[PDB]
Design a protein around this ligand. Structure first.
Ligand SMILES: Cc1cc(CCCCCCCOc2ccc(C3=N[C@@H](C)CO3)cc2)on1
Ligand SMILES: Cc1cc(CCCCCCCOc2ccc(C3=N[C@@H](C)CO3)cc2)on1
Lengths: 236, 273, 40, 255, 273, 59, 59, 57, 40, 40
């Protein structure tokens, strides 16, 4: 008989501990694995695939239309859309990125925001996208917007433009859940010159917008998502 | 590892930021393709986002309850909770369910922890330590009819006996019939015109039966069982869109009617911040 | 040290440290180079 | 002078040419291949009809109009009646296959509109009834007709609400599945190569569909002034590397 | 090591005891610079004054309380202490606080011990062993509303279950967002005219929720939770003047008005002994 | 199963003992350290800095 | 005295676990084995012997 | 280990499927003696049918 | 590691991995070859 | 022997045995020698 002493914590059950256990089914042989395409190893692998952002959130019931950012022909100087960058809330929240970020407490890294244009091929347009780093207000006019991170996008044969929100930060991690101290800025978009439709054409054209994370990205300290809950256990 | 390299002014014919999303690719664009950057290192590995880590902590998967009371004159033990039973399944509670259904096929060993606590609702005396018996009744094997049937002999069926207030823990290998468990199944068990659709038909893994071994004391004792499940040795294939609407049933994808808009409406314009 | 005989009884697995998003981010048949035109 | 843009796919006795492609997607970066022995279970030698089943079948055409919500086809169902592919299907106990899907929609440089073409492995549909109502067989086996998401709820059928992918997930995130867009201004076809994806090495072709192909208008069709307000969309699909096993009497399936 | 060397009479032009304190230095003068000394050795290392040792013993950081009682008809569990919750913080109790605030920035892993003892104020019978559940609810994750919400499933959030009367112990890595925790912060969360000043804004580390898993017995049971915290792997920068006045608030430096003189007045003259 | 005997003191909590514990946050990666001037290692380092004495205590 | 911590599952009895136990009969010597024809090692050995099927179940 | 070997058409004078059960033997006939098979491996050892396992719980 | 002195006290035995059905499936005195006629 | 995988779970650290008061006691720009005049 070897002398032992038990410490504080004996008998506790910590849902996060990782130890060995007896197998209830001694000697059982599991089914062989066969090959299946698509294996995922890290959630970091999947948040780099871009998905659509319901940017046009202004509706009243969920609709395919809140994915469409409208553009008006012949407007000059004006603003196309605006949003803050709380990736865990608001427009971002239902996107795959938003949806995964919510399983973690802290995030750090660059984001990739792209816009794909869908107007007739014989039209043309020049837009400016601007990222405003924390510390200033959402820009109120392009002059204000153009003094921060921006890209003049020229609509052409190449249909999409990929803007990166480079990680601009004092503190090396921000909370996913809306924190002030930890806030990331604003994203706005304005006409640089203006949309022009060809003859025989009319109305609004739309941009689709996507979001995905750069390879830069870090997420840490897992927790429970506000995105799902329940009141009684389900049954069959 | 560098998180960003140093990059300076650019005036090229080589534009990495113009792409065609119609192709289905997400081109790997970085901050340094469109602004001037400085070197910085990652200092991070992405350890805690590994799927083994993501699915590897215990989650509550089931709460049931049984009572110790005089079975004298009870015509239906099962019905008196003289011994409940649970149709093993992993979608009855939703926190873990949404996590698993981020994948289509999943393969893992399970580690179960079972916590059992007692409650004495009707003002009482001395509680004699109750011992719970948890049997595995796979499909094809006699299922218990009374709280003290021959079934409980469990001569060939793994069973664990632990005390109420304590915890029991053991681990079961991956018991799936195929190479992975289907998180989803767009099929039937056969080409029947009225057979059920879904995985319910693939989920068969039988049930697990709990009972108190103790005979009855003078008062009644409620024992409530909580089953926790931890995936170990995880393998996951084919990522899918996360669950947006609420769940209604074990094993079907169905959402409730007149549900509410899941996308938050802006308080303001598209232009609003 | 494993104290138990069966493999299911061992603790959690250890980090894939695999990581290759290209099956998801670039499943295109003809390879796309960043910087070259998307559609030629 | 090769462009990403022009392409030719010859499979069996049938060829497709597109002069306005946008590359092609190969699901999960894997190309269809036959079933290796190391992965095999059934001891039966399999049958590989080759060129008589691995050719291109063009399903009947759809009509995109400003009110369209989107269409959904299931595989191998959509092909249950095409030539010898279909016969083989009803006659063997088990079968396995990959596909080349080519979705076509041409317009002019004055039109606008953008379709999402996506392949979803194991697309289990939801009942519009809620609760645990099931979706009857016939409803998930529309055949070449596919399911029309702008048709009315029917009884025993699935829900046809587009912002929810017919299953409780948001349209916006379908992009995690192999997919390609058809943006009239860019593109005129979409091509996806689908490797066989299952948790078993070979399965039944009638009780289980292993992918749904979905074509969904996202930016509404907008025709030039006084143009007819609609465009046809055509879907052509070719089984590839098909194998059938366990031949016998010929399945009888509901309806 | 010598504590003092031998030194004899001196009659020099080299005076080590005259200095200019205006410079900000504390010149390293020793007994042997001004008296005649003999050799002596230190016999000591200064082991127990290492900062790891100084901050490394468990200190009580929080006492809360929850009760097990029939929740039937309770409209606000939180309010009935059917499950309390604690806004994790390390300045609520002062013994440890004064110790930490001897430094400006501090970095360490934490080891928590949680002792839970039960009290039965209203004359009672048999007490059935209660099991406490301690959840970590970091900020952004659903916070419990009833004592038996879906939240308690805690499928992704670390939780420990232990018995009242026992102790639970686990250790959490340094969870700070920056490189160190700020013991002080002369800033705001943004340039707002009315935002709060201090670290309260930097202290965010979320809260921790306790509840009893047991249903109710006939009597009521008070369970009082004591959280102990031990720093391990300590790193401390920039020493500061020790706290002289009493504390009034978590996270602000504020002292009470009409406080009392903190320097003891002489009973006698400056000249007094 | 290896035979053991538990000694007096089992289960006690001594605020001054130093042992290992399970981490509640398995696999989490702490923020990198950056350099900060002023690190203190021993309280013996700081009690050698001189400070003023309120000698005139008579108020 | 070596410090220990007990995990969840301590004290449980799992009918399928396989561990060592003290022998109640220390030092006892079992009867020698003699040879007996017919040893079975696997149930897989015996299910390969064919047996009759009551196919005509209609009684 | 192979569970089934590959075997093709047969037109022989050597018939493994005709036997005389009166002898008391169970002749070791396999799928490949009477249909055309493909190779497949066992992937299994028969561990949990060992008598030690069967009587050991 | 055995902690106990007697052999009865050790854990379960380990798989025969013996397996030879012929004592049961082919106890015939003159050897029968599959493919050759049963009765000559 | 660490029984646990993560570094936070290890016991207390071990004595700096670093000790250098000069950053606090003599942060002067031009070095002062004891015995030499303070102000020259
Ligand atoms: C005593 C005792 C009690 C037991 C129980 C043995 C464990 C058997 C359960 C096997 C694992 O069960 C499932 C059920 C469903 C799924 C699953 N359904 C889909 C959504 C995904 O995964 C996976 C495992 O063993 N010994
Ligand atoms: C179950 C379970 C419960 C828990 C809790 C996890 C620990 C999280 C707490 C992190 C450490 O908290 C703080 C808070 C404040 C400070 C601090 N404030 C300043 C005065 C100085 O330091 C340091 C650590 O984990 N698992």
């Amino acid at each position: 008989g070897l002398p032992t002493t038990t410490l504080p914590g004996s008998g506790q059950f910590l849902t996060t501990d990782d130890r060995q256990s007896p197998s209830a089914l001694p000697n059982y042989e599991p089914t062989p694995r066969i090959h299946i395409p698509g294996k995922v190893h890290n959630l970091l692998e999947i948040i780099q695939v871009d998905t659509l952002i319901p940017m046009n959130n202004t509706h009243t019931k969920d609709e395919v239309n809140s994915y469409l950012i409208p553009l008006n022909a012949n407007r000059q100087n004006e603003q196309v859309f605006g949003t803050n960058l709380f990736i865990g809330d608001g427009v971002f929240k239902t996107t795959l990125l938003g949806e995964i970020v919510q399983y973690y407490t802290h995030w750090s890294g660059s984001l990739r925001f792209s816009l794909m244009y869908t107007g007739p091929a014989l039209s043309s347009a020049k837009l400016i996208l601007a990222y405003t780093p924390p510390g200033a207000r959402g820009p109120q006019d392009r002059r204000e917007a153009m003094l921060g991170t921006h890209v003049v996008w020229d609509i052409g044969l190449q249909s999409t433009i990929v803007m990166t929100i480079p990680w601009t930060s004092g503190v090396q991690f921000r909370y996913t859940d809306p924190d002030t101290y930890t806030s990331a800025g604003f994203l706005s978009c304005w006409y640089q010159t203006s949309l022009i439709l060809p003859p025989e054409t009319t109305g609004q054209v739309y941009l689709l917008s996507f979001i995905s994370a750069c390879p830069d990205f870090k997420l840490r300290l897992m927790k429970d998502t506000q995105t799902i809950s329940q009141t009684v256990a389900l049954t069959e | 590892t560098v998180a960003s390299i140093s990059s300076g002014p650019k005036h090229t014919q080589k534009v990495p930021i113009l792409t065609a999303n119609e192709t289905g690719a997400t081109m790997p664009v970085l901050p340094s393709d469109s602004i001037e950057t400085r070197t910085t290192y990652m200092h991070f590995n992405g350890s805690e986002t590994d799927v083994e880590c993501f699915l590897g902590r215990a989650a509550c998967v089931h709460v049931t309850e049984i009572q110790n009371k005089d079975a004298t004159g009870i015509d239906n033990h099962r019905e008196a909770k003289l011994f409940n039973d649970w149709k093993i399944n992993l979608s009855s509670l939703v926190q873990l369910r949404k996590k698993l259904e981020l994948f289509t096929y999943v393969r893992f060993d399970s580690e179960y922890t079972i916590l059992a606590t007692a409650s004495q609702p009707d003002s009482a005396n001395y509680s004699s330590n109750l011992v719970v018996q948890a049997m595995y009744v796979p499909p094809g094997a006699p299922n218990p009819k009374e709280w003290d049937d021959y079934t409980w002999q469990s001569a060939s069926n793994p069973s664990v006996f632990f005390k109420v207030g304590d915890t029991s823990r053991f681990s079961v290998p991956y018991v799936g019939l195929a190479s992975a468990y289907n998180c989803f199944y767009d099929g039937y068990s056969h080409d029947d015109a009225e057979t059920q659709y879904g995985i319910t038909v693939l989920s068969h893994m039988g049930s697990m039966a709990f009972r108190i071994v103790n005979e009855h004391d003078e008062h009644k004792t409620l024992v409530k069982i909580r089953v926790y499940h931890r995936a170990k040795h995880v393998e996951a294939w084919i990522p899918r869109a996360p669950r947006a609407l609420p769940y209604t049933s074990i094993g079907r994808t169905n959402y409730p009617k007149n549900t509410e808009p899941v996308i938050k409406k802006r308080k303001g314009d598209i232009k609003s911040y | 040290i494993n104290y138990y005989k069966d493999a299911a009884s061992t603790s959690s697995a250890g980090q894939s440290l695999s990581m290759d998003p290209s099956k998801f981010t670039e499943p295109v048949k003809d390879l796309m180079l960043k910087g070259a035109p998307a559609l030629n | 002078g090769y462009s990403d843009r022009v392409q030719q796919i010859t499979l069996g006795n049938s060829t497709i040419t597109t002069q306005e492609a946008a590359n092609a997607v190969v699901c999960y970066a894997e190309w269809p291949e036959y079933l290796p022995d190391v992965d095999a279970s059934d001891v039966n030698k399999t049958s590989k009809p080759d060129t008589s089943v691995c050719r291109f079948y063009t399903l009947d055409s759809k009509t995109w109009t400003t009110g369209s919500k989107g269409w959904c086809w299931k595989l191998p169902d959509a092909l249950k009646d095409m030539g010898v592919f279909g016969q083989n299907m009803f006659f063997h106990s088990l079968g396995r296959s990959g596909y080349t899907v080519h979705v076509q929609c041409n317009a002019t440089k004055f039109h606008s509109g953008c379709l999402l073409v996506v392949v979803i492995p194991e697309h289990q549909l939801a009942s519009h009834e809620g609760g645990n109502v099931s979706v009857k067989y016939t409803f998930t086996h529309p055949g070449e007709r596919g399911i029309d998401l702008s048709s009315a709820n029917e009884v025993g059928g699935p829900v046809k609400d587009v912002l929810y992918n017919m299953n409780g997930t948001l349209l916006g995130n379908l992009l995690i599945f192999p997919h390609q867009f058809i943006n009239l201004r860019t593109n005129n076809t979409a091509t996806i190569v689908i490797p066989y994806i299952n948790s078993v090495p070979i399965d039944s072709m009638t009780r289980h569909n292993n992918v749904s192909l979905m074509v969904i208008p996202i930016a509404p069709l907008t025709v030039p002034t006084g143009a007819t307000p609609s465009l046809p969309i055509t879907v052509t699909i070719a089984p590839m590397c098909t194998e059938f096993s366990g031949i016998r009497s010929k399945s009888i399936v509901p309806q």
